[PDB]
Structure formats: C-alpha cells, structure tokens
Write a protein that binds this ligand. Structure first.
Ligand SMILES: Cn1cc2c(CC(=O)N3CC[C@H](C(N)=O)C3)cccc2n1
Ligand SMILES: [Zn+2]
Length: 140
C-alpha cells in the first residue's frame, strides 16, 4: 500500500483505489495502473521533473529502502494477476530488486523528488509506474 500526496492530489495504484478515490476522480489510466483523486488537505510531496535512472525505493515486505538503477518508462508485458488479465503496461520502469504484491504503492525517489510508485514485480525484478510526465500534478 501507499500513495503520493502532491498539492490537492492523491496518486495511488489504480487496482488499490478506494470508493472515495473513484467518487473524487481527477484522472485514471488502466494501462498505467494509476489513479489520481482530489483531496481537501494539501500534500507535501514534490514530483521529480528529470530523466534520473538511479534512486531509492521503499520495500514494505523487507521494511527497507533499497538504492537501485532502473530503466526508462516503456511499454512492458505484465503477467495476469487477480487485478488485471495479461496485458502491456505503459510508462513502466524496471529494476533488479525484491518485491511482493503488497509492496505496490512504495515510493521510488531520486534527488529531485518522487519518480513513481511500485506497481509490478516477480522473479527478482520490480516495476514502478512513472509519474514524472504528469506535469499538471504541480498546478491547479
Ligand atoms: C510489486 N509486485 C507486484 C507483483 C506481482 C503482480 C501483482 O500482484 N500485480 C497486481 C497488479 C499489478 C499490475 N500493475 O499489473 C501486478 C506478482 C508477484 C510479485 C509482485 N511484486
Ligand atoms: Zn531526478
């Protein structure tokens, strides 16, 4: 579990979004596994605006923050799960690291701020949904 709180926005994995999130929906994309909902309170996270390929992510299944190298956002084949059939997920970045389904929502960050959240994994590889292209998160 986990979310990014930037301004009056809440960014979560689409497959973990709540009823309040769907009721207060701003934008969602099934192919990115992302959902953004509105909030009444202001958040304190900063979204990175960069091309960094190194950062640190939180892994709740180990209670640890791991430094990683990750690939640039791309269209990747993702195996079926209880949340989606087998499909291609867009804007996804991979790293060599540990992850379990419950780790989704863990933040990946670089020196410029939040890069994305854990979204896929298995076989010693962890995938993160990129948020750095969503410029509107910094305004209105
Ligand atoms: C973070 N992580 C996801 C894992 C999965 C796959 C899985 O449960 N999901 C849920 C939806 C997500 C998606 N975006 O398609 C994939 C299997 C094994 C280890 C995993 N570590
Ligand atoms: Zn950066």
């Amino acid at each position: 579990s986990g979310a990014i709180y930037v301004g009056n926005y809440r960014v979560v994995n689409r497959h973990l979004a709540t009823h309040n999130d769907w009721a207060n929906l701003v934008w969602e994309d099934s192919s990115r596994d992302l959902l953004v909902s509105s909030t009444t309170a202001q958040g304190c996270d900063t979204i990175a605006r960069c091309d960094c390929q190194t950062g640190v992510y939180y892994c709740s299944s180990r209670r640890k923050h791991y430094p990683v190298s990750f690939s640039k956002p791309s269209l990747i084949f993702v195996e079926a799960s209880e949340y989606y059939p087998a499909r291609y997920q867009s804007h996804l970045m991979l790293a060599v690291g540990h992850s379990e389904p419950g780790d989704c929502g863990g933040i990946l960050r670089c020196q410029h701020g939040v890069v994305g959240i854990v979204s896929t994994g298995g076989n010693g590889l962890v995938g993160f949904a990129d948020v750095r292209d969503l410029l509107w998160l910094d305004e209105e």
